[PDB]
Amino acid sequence: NLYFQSEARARLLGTATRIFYAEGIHSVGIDRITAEAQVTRATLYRHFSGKDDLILAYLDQADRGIRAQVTAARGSSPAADGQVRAVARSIVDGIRSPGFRGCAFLNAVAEYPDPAHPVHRAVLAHRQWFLDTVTELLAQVGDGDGVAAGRHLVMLRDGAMAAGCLFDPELVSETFLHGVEGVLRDVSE
Amino acid sequence: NLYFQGMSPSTEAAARTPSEARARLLGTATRIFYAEGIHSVGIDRITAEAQVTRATLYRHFSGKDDLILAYLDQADRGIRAQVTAARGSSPAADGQVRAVARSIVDGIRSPGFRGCAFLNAVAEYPDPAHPVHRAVLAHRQWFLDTVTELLAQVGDGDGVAAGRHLVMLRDGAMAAGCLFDPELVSETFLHGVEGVLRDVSE
Ligand SMILES: [Cl-]
Ligand SMILES: [Cl-]
Ligand SMILES: [Cl-]
Ligand code: NA
Ligand code: NA
């Protein structure tokens, strides 16, 4: 459904995911989450240690889903450049999907700016994994180490995810794919 | 000073704002909302740190939303001034793009950088009907129009694709500038801008 995608626990996690992703975090109270999840507050605390734990579980779901999708993209082509293209296509398919609302991690970090906050740490860990992954792919496309190119590809991805819910998603996706082709060309020379 | 707080717009704002109480309110809201976020920061925090009563707040602003919009308006004015000054600093269309890019980098590298004020606000105000969302889109469209018009003057084409590309790099740079080594972010961004300039020139 969304780009990264006990019955009571599943309803809680699914509801928190949907609402936090679409609407934001601080503005969304556990009373609304429990009401929409059709559980009580006591049931929420039976599964999660509080709102913070629930937020982290939401982000963990997103992390796991994205990792699976990026891994599947890497599995979809035997060629390093084909794998980069497949990752880029996955990103676009998310951007153009109904209910796209930007990067879950960039949206969370806007609200959790203290670097040592667990939400902030989760954001940085996910981002570093993604940077490492695309850097490694690009290192296999050309003779160089892919380090500068990886940063470049991440910059394009960050701008695409940010603008995809603020500007025509078809146009954002077109610009992003052209940018990716340019990075692939750049490293091949 | 925050990245959007230049001498010209700040001085002109001061001339428009003879109330010291109003100035403390706006300065306090700007500092805290920018650094920390918006929903998590109550008007009770702003009045305390602005050293005014709640009744003084409401004498100057109609509520929290009015104050948020005033903060974003000052950021908008400050960035417009900086970008327009950057365009004034070079007579050449490509030099103007490079100057705008240097202005962006200067902000990213500045102490207290905490990302794009507008991207951070819209993360918290996703409802397109909300005045904060509308303000963010208005600022962004002005910026896209501005760089598209510059790029249209660098090469023979209309600069439309190039302008969207430059905005994508800018958005990525602002988003990552507080999440990654700002010097490395700046280097990547400037290299990207050079690539866009080359692309439009053929
Ligand atoms: Cl109001
Ligand atoms: Cl002017
Ligand atoms: Cl600027
Ligand atoms: Na925080
Ligand atoms: Na870093």
CATH number, residue B36: 1.10.357.10
Q: Is A185 exposed, middle or buried (0-12, 13-18, 19+ CB in 10 A)?
A: exposed
* Contact by Cβ (8 Å): A153, A76: no
Of A23, A159, A165, the CB nearest to B169: A159
From CA B43, how far away is CA B87, in angstroms rounded?
38
> Nearest CB to A151: which of B37, B40, B188?
B188
Q: Is A157 on the interface with B (CB under 8 A)?
A: yes
Task: Tell me the CA distances in angstroms from B90 to A105, B7, B42, B143, B194, one per residue in order.
Answer: 38, 20, 43, 18, 16
Task: Please give the tally of structural domains in chain B.
Answer: 1
End-to-end CA distance of chain A: give it in Å, rounded: 39
Whole-angstrom distance, CA of residue B66 vs CA of residue B42: 13
Q: Which of A24, A158, A163 sits opposite B126 (nearest CB)?
A: A24
Ligand 2 centroid distance, CA of B74 (Å)? 15
CA angle B19, B20, B21 (to 5 degrees): 90
Return d(Cα A93, Cα A76) in angstroms, integer: 15
**Closest residue in A to B127 (Cα–Cα):** A23
Tell me the shortest Cα–Cα distance from A120 to chain B, in angstroms. Answer: 9
Are B179 and A124 in contact (CB < 8 Å)? Answer: yes
Three-state SS sequence of chain A? CCCCCCHHHHHHHHHHHHHHHHHCCCCCCHHHHHHHHCCCHHHHHHHCCCHHHHHHHHHHHHHHHHHHHHHHHHHCCCCHHHHHHHHHHHHHHHHCCCCCCCCHHHHHHHHCCCCCCHHHHHHHHHHHHHHHHHHHHHHCCCCCCCHHHHHHHHHHHHHHHHHCCCCCHHHHHHHHHHHHHHHHHHHHC
* Euclidean distance between CA atoms A143 and A80, whole angstroms: 12
Comparing alpha-carbon positions, the chain B residue that sits nearest to A165 is B126
CB contact under 8 A, B171 and A158: yes
Answer yes or no: do A111 and B199 touch at CB < 8 A: no
Write A132-135 long-range contacts (CB < 8 A, 24+): A133/A70, A134/A84, A134/A87
Hey, what long-range contacts does A119-128 have (CB within 8 A, 24 or more apart)? A119/A52, A119/A55, A119/A56, A119/A59, A122/A56, A122/A59, A122/A60, A122/A63, A123/A59, A123/B179, A124/B179, A126/A59, A126/A63, A126/A66, A127/A154, A127/B179, A127/B180
**B-chain residues near A106 (CB < 8 A):** 119, 123, 175
List the single residue in B with minimal CA-CA distance to A22. Answer: B126
What is the rounded distance in angstroms from the CA atom of residue B176 to the CA atom of residue B108? 9
- Is A111 touching B (CB cutoff 8 A)? yes
Residue keyed to tokens 């308006």: B73
Instruction: Report which residue type is found at B165.
Output: H
DSSP string, B121-179: HHHH---TTSHHHHHHHHHHHHHHHHHHHHHHTTSSS-SHHHHHHHHHHHHHHHHHTTT
B161 part of contact set with chain A, CB < 8 Å: yes
Listed residue (B83, B98, B67) closest to B9, CA to CA? B83
- In order, the DSSP letters of B12-77 are HHHHH---HHHHHHHHHHHHHHHHH-STTS-HHHHHHHHT--HHHHHHH-SSHHHHHHHHHHHHHH
Interior/surface letters B160-185, b for 16+ CB within 10 angstroms, e for the rest: ebbbbbbbbbbbbbbbbbbbbebeeb
Cα→Cα distances A168→A2, A96, A102, Å: 18, 9, 13
Closest residue in chain A to residue B139, using alpha carbons only: A166
Query: How far is the first Cα of chain B from the last one, in angstroms, to the nearest whole number?
Result: 39
**Contact between residue B189 and residue A149 where contact means Cβ atoms under 8 Å apart:** no
- A48 CA to centre of ligand 4 in angstroms: 20
C-alpha A76: how far from chain center: 20
Structure tokens at A65: 């889903």
Nearest to A175 among B164, B176, B189 (CB): B164
Best CA proximity match to B41, nearest among B30, B57, B52: B30
How is residue B30 written in tokens?
């700007």
- Note whether B161 contacts A178, CB cutoff 8 Å: yes
Domain that holds residue B168: 1-202
Cα–Cα distance for residue pair A130/A103, rounded to 1 Å: 13
CA distance A116 to chain B (A): 12
What gap in Å lies between CA B21 and CA A76, rounded to an integer? Answer: 61
- CA nearest to A4, candidates A68, A80, A55, A78: A68
Cα–Cα separations (whole angstroms), residue A139 to A45, A56, B182: 46, 32, 23
